Amino acid sequence: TKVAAKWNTSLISLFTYFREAIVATEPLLDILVKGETRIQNRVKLGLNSKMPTRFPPAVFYTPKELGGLGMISASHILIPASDLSWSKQTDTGITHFRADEKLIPTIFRYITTWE
RNA sequence: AUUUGGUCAAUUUGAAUACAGAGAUCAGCAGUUCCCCUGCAUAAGGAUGAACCGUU
């Protein structure tokens, strides 16, 4: 959680400051991509010695308060349709839901350009 | 393109039993040190009071 928070701080610091300029500088973008991945992998490593095929993004990007890590993504992350299903136990029965495409929203859209 | 990072311990053994592993929480009081006040003692050191004359 702490690590995630730190990452968020770093990312926010980068963006809130260089707002408009990050979109141009490709190297920085690449680093961000990779950095995020690295961060994710640390957590993965902690969880298990074997690295997973794929975690759900849920565990990372879901907020601190819901019980996630609350990473603030800087990448084209793909929330797989499989990882959006859910169920509900009721008196009537067990109503389900399953699943365009869903993408973890990136910090980019949410900081207003300096101009 | 495959794979290692994945062994419960403990006990009974000459695999079975176990099955994660064995005081908590709330509250007093005293002591320790330093400080302040208070009463007493001990030394020291003052300050002062009390009629009226004394002793070979």
Cβ neighbourhood burial of A65 (10 Å; 0-12, 13-18, 19+): exposed
Structure tokens at A2: 């702490």
Strand B, nucleotides covered by protein (CB < 7 Å): 5-6
Instruction: Establish whether the CB of A53 is closer than 7 Å to any nucleic acid atom in strand B.
Output: no
3-state secondary structure A68-86: CCCCCCCCCCECCHHHHCE
- Which technique was the structure solved with, according to the deposited record? cryo-EM
Q: How far is the CA of A1 from the C1' of B37 (A)?
A: 56
Long-range own/partner contacts, residues A44-52 (CB < 8 A, 24 or more apart): none
Residue A66: phi and psi, rounded to 5, are -70, -15
Take residue A8 and report the two structure tokens written for it.
Answer: 């968020």
Resolution (Å units): 3.6
